[model samples]
Target: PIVLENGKLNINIDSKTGCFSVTEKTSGHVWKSDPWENAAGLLTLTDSKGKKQTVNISKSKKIEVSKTAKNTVSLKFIDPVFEDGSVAKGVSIATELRLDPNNAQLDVEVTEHRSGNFTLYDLRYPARAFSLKTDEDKGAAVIPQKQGVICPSYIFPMNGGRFCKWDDATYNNKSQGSLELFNNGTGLTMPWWGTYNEKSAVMGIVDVSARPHMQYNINNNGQYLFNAKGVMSPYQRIVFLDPIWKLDQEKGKMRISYHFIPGGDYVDMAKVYQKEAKARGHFVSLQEKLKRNPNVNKLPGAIYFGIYGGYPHYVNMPGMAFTFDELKNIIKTIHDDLRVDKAFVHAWGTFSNFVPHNYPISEALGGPEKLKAAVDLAKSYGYLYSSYHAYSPMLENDPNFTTDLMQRDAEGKLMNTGSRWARVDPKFQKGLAQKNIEKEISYLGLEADITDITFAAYRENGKEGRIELAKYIDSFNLVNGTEHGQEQWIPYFDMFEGMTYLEDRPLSVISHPAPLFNLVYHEAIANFGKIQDPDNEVTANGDFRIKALRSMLFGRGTTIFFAPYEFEGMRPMIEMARDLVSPVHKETFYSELKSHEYLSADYKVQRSRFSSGTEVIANLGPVAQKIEGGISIPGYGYRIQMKDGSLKTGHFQVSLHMD
Candidate 1:
């Protein structure tokens, strides 16, 4: 709409109900930053004169001036470069806005004493939407009575496959390095894994928490800004997550969006609402938008799901026994109730790892029979499965592989660091080490190793002073002094108890190395439960006589079962996540399959940005709704006449290719 003042013309914009707003001046200005809460509404700005200035406008008064009193204006110079009076020269109230979560609007007034001509500007910085009134300022902005959609986020590689490939910023375009994200081929994470959404459309699954080597969150401004983690999994990459989704405007098909660090491997999950908003779409309120989507699905972004229980143990490790009829029933239930299509089974319970347990040559986790059953089950259902493998230790005895976590003495004895390998003689420890290493070497030999993990077994040593196997050692003793023992092998032991050994192998059911690791690494050690011999330092939740009885499970494992845990503590979140991701994965699968046809269409798009290291799946679907500069649509493109009888147009850069 046009709002003309005398001879000058300014444009007025109201985002679709509660999305975004643009001011009415030639400057193309929009509310970018909101520091109103800092100090009675002061704005930090860089004026056209190239000076940085903090303009102190009474937050309350700015609200009033934006609404009614448009005559008087306020201006500030960012730097001393401008003459004292220059702050008042060629300047007019270009734009005003109340940016915040609850409310969002743009206000503008051209001053009479200033030049009526406006300058062109670009809007690409972080902006805010806020409460618009004196009373509103005291509180929050007015939220749209109607909430928006909540789309699910899918993890990659598993959901990948069949999508366009592009170089990621991490590793400086190296495709094989650890990635914060992954794609199967399609940009979406779980492609070709499920059926379409039957109810309100499902989006995708997501992990709200950030990870290292990937996009994550950083603390700043009393809040956490989402960012990339240290390094992502070698499999994680933007190209792998290149699933294209279609926005069936007419039939209301479905559209999805994701938050991109672009260069970083992590996400800023601490900014929960902000991250969610970025993933769905810019300018669109996620909650409000999702509500309109009948078939909408949503996920936290990334989550860990594997068939095995926690750490693999010789006796308690997962077997076909863990795969009860109830398990299958749950799978069916997921499809029936939650629309689940894609799932991950820890290939062989916690034993899914390529290496043998730090114990013996015993086949504990249901052996191959159990794994065959699980794999068959998943394959029978046409589900995609991923094998979980973290970097194993490099011990002195293990010739080919690295076994760094083990503490070796001059005599080549297992210098009992934490306590995991206690009760065993040096021969046994060395022999077991050799056995496990050979097994891992065999995998490496067979080229079965994931090749994704670069380094493993970091040490922060716990209270015990010993470095736990593959666990982060705590820093109670700091870097200078050793707490438990001495030297690298024998550090402190404060986290969990120690590892114990039997005649052949080290058996550890519970290893409480770190709180975070216990929570996250449980799936990695799915087969460790069977070795719960508290008497044996390595036993998991062993019944042995440990001083504190509570030390059993709480000391070692949290004993949280994934399924029931989903039904209890975070049921709503879990259910919502499952529902959101299931159909989205399926939708992405279709998008990838349809790319060949699109490639044959009249699209002349170059990689513009491509990564050879990145595994690009030319067959995957589009990445966005539309492209800018590359394609144009009449005002009618994705635009429709709203109830107010005004038409709205949105630009999208779709990321799909055709056959």
Candidate 2:
């Protein structure tokens, strides 16, 4: 017990067993590595660094525990060897396990070295930290995915499912915003994940030091295995961080902070990062973020009305869209008849490209003259009118397509972000952005622009590239928003177009979806689904009741693409959304999501409480459910309890807002 004791945690090691265990003092919860698995492994490449450094991985290796430190222990591996027994040398690696004795906060720290003179690679230590028991107390592993997902230890894969696969990183250069890699897609948004049992939980976060080369890998047993996409590990999930990445890139100590909580879950882990983020100067709340942008006020307590002007296939052509004049009418009616004081209007595809290269207006959407009129009307009414555009995906045939702008893969072939659009790697695009931003603002006459792929672009070509754009746009006083959102953008962005999301079905069948991102930064950023269309968007593959219930339950912001039709018959859905979601969000936008609870054991009846004392109880289960105080909620029903004690209860239902 005294191996390396701190007031809250005690670290122990056994030379004979070649293992280590971390014990939480208050609750006596023990976290030890799976005895069968090695202490750690090293991830290496076929060759040294360059555009040449692709992810040709050397998986799993044996590690030896070494000398010690204050609340810390060291690790050593000789002339490294792969899982296949192939040896690696010239790269000496050493690591230490250190506990924070001064604070005694539950953090297990590791400082790794790029002791060997070489290019970039990785080290996954303390393999699969704990073993799972085939029982309820075993809990499950929670990954920091887009939102967050719960991977309960196999009772045979989640209903017999595994993680979706990823593309191999030819050069592992996501920093280039190039292509998907064993490291691409929405992986760990914040750089950490955890495994929890009924008794305790432990979270592992890579300190920016190794964030680029990191991926969250989990196996059937819910072990946190750090490996790549094609590692041949059965029943596993992986999250790719960057296109081109490497960890322990230099000769300093690379740290991984492993923190623990007794009797905790993913919620507890999220709070852990929240505290750490604040300490790191990374957290900036909504109330504070709005001080800089006068328009952010239009977002809270408002329903986002998204209107598309042009189609991808027919950029200059139009149809399946709403005209600017028509939009002004909707706002006019809402403001005058409905007495709707607040709302945000988002116009999509008004311009085909982000820079609006030629500053050409979408001919399909009522042209320049009519469009600015609508913009002026919305602003005159105190409503924020925004222009939306896609920052990713550019055509090679487009006049701007330049060779240096392309992100090349290992084969030296251009990388695709989507369709024939080659990734205009932000590194090069930064120069282009400098030249055209003012031109973009010149004709748009917009209050804000929610650029697609902005959040995802945070790590693209590196945050450097994304921030470079935001910081520059800052001068124009144009509020920045993105389809994707991340914490770092809090200072520069307001509306997170796709921040709150659902996909292909009733959530993840393999895992339970939790609002990890919103929970941590809800008060700082406003989020919406993928620019969710009136009703069809969210209800595409799932039930509207459940999806609507999800929107209402999370912190407040709702926006829908409007294809006005059937006149007033579409009123019901819009009114319902206003009553159910907008007002609820209006109150909580500046408030924090204090906590979330699964009122039922089946995880069907969920409850969320905002710091404002507002609570939302959503019944997602099939049958009826009753919560405390004997409040009976029929299937697909939701109850809103405002701090004023005024209650709004309704059974879930939806109508096509437009024909």
Candidate 3:
């Protein structure tokens, strides 16, 4: 056993097995290594002909260890072996392990280099190849899976956690690699994961540094297996004949770093990511946004209403509901009725036929001048009118549609094959964006534009397209509203429409739903839609109280769907925001999650607190349950614990009005 000490942590590396056993000094918690597997590191190499080889350093011949600094240890492992037990010539990997003196954290950097025709396929280092027994692993794993999710560690084979990717050839059946929480699908945004028991917690921050194309994977082993694997694209397999697109490497070196937090739960790990986000300027508070656009604060409140091209069931289809004059009248009526001062006007251009450069006011819905009149009229009523635009997917017959402007795959071919609709390339989008903005601002005089399909947009260089596009939108000093919440777009987006879960049904065994995403950036951006779902369709029963209740707990702004002469029913739901929710619009989030007890087995009755010292106790249970201060909250009812520690209780009241 090789031992190294750094005040807060004592690490033991097994010389024979090349695994780690960590001891957290402050908490006196011990995390042992995997008894069966060697968790050291591996480098996968593939030659030009598609031949593959995995180099493992466990059986390295010459192991050199030296103290590099007061709290850093360096390890050099020479000449490893191939998976077939053949000698791996001309290959070496160097590792630096350092302890952060301030906290019980460890930083590990693994650098590997090889000189040959082989290309680097994947790098598995500090691979949490260890295990903590399930019975003893009484903790939860926090993963940034589609916003964020928390999985309890005690559950085994929870089913829904696995993420897999298959090569193009064997995609009919076989997988190149399979792992849970992999970055390929919506697994991670920041490449970080955390797990903690009652006594201690551990966070693994996979630092990708300058490379945005890197991938990381994690798992919640009831056995408590926590590891991160890094992957690079254009896999070693030869998918194309062209040299520019083929995966080739003459000489290559890659480094993957991990910052391990030895103590803290999910909240602490979230703060770690949050602090990094804030430092990088990815967060801006509501107060700051309002300060920049005082026009927003002058509105009745933060609640917004939507007016699409069509009404009712045919909403997603095309057709005009209100002309410019009629739209202004409806906007004023809603403000007078429910105090909503913002409108998400959809299909103001050609409805549903989302053509790329066809942003002219739809002649079917009242030409350009009439549209301008409607916008001006809405603003006069203290309303901020906004429209929508999709990032790509151009109509083939559209005047600006060009095959050269379509996105291309790695093989230098159009991403979509012979499709009538094409996704715009980054170069084409840049000029189109500039032109569109000029038209919207100068001709139409629109205040904001809600960009669609931006949640997953990425540039050719691996940088997220939303971040790059945001810089363009920000230049005009206008508000940027995206279709949904993306972690990186928090700073630029003034408002986001869709905040619901991507999955209709959440994974019931491994984890339950929580407002983890909102808790992190809620104050910075005004998020709308259902807390647990994206389906905001109006129901026939008119029971929208639960939506209002959840919004209050999650600190989300409200959005109502309205159209010509078809919105009198939304009055109660809209008022819920104006009177109950929007009153605390400027309050700050506590940044930490406060726990609550459940009243029933369904996990319905619960309470949560905000930074303003206000608590929202919600009773989603069908039956009434007496809560704090002897207040009996009815089914679908809620009580707001004011900042002064006083409680205000009310049922789902559609008739309750403030004016």
Pairwise TM-score winner, candidates 1 and 2: 2
Question: Residue-wise lDDT of candidate 2 within 1-659, one digit each (tens)?
Answer: 22777677777866433356788888887776543343443344434322223221212144466546566666554454444455445544555667777543434333444435455454444443544443334476666566566655433321112223111111123211212111214455666766777788777665654443433332232222324443532422221121123453434334567777888887888888888777766677777767877777877777677665443323544445566677678778766776667777776555543332424665655777777787888888878776655444565446665556657877888676454532666555456555545665666566776665545534434457767766766666665676666666666677676654345421244456678877787877777766443443545324456656777666746656654553354455567677777788888888888888777655668889999889999887567788889988877888889989999887864348876
Predicted model with the maximum lDDT: 2
- List ranges where model 1 is wrong by over 4 Å: 1-22, 26-305, 312-348, 352-362, 392-659
Error of 3 at 654 (Å): 14
lDDT of 3 by residue, 1-659 (tens): 77777677788877664666678787888766533345466556663455776555666666666666877777776666665566555556677777776666777666445545445555455543323334456556565554565554443321132212111112221211232222223344454655566677666555434221222222221121212233333222111000010113312222323334555666666666666667767678767877887554533245656665552122234444666667766666766765654544443333323445535556666677777777777767655766656545556545455677677777888775554433665455656666566777787676666665544322224345545667787676665566665656666767777654454322322344456666567667667663223213434212366666666666666666554455566565566666666665434322233433333334456676777777787865456777557767788788777787777777764356788
In candidate 3, list every pair of residues with a backbone clash: 128-227, 221-224
Q: After superposition, how far is residue 70 of candidate 3 from its true place, in Å?
A: 3.1
C-alpha root-mean-square deviation, each candidate: 24.6, 6.7, 8.3
Q: Report, for every candidate in turn, its global Cα lDDT versus the true structure.
A: 0.24, 0.59, 0.54
Error of 2 at 87 (Å): 5.6
TM-score per model over all chains: 0.25, 0.80, 0.76
Residue-by-residue lDDT tens digits, candidate 1, 1-659 = 22213221222322111112223233332221233222222223356665554343222122222222232122221211122433423432223222221222122211111222222121111122211212111111100000100111221221122112211212232221121212111111111110011111111222222111211100011111112454433321111111111111112211122211111111111122233434543222222323433111221111223333333322234333243333445445544554444443222233433232333322544354444444456546544333333233332233333334455767887554443323222222333334454453343221111111111112222313222321232221111111011111211221111121121211011001111111111111111111123222223222212211111111121111242223333333335434332222222211111101111121211111011111111111223223445443221122222223443333223248989
Error of 2 at 126 (Å): 1.7
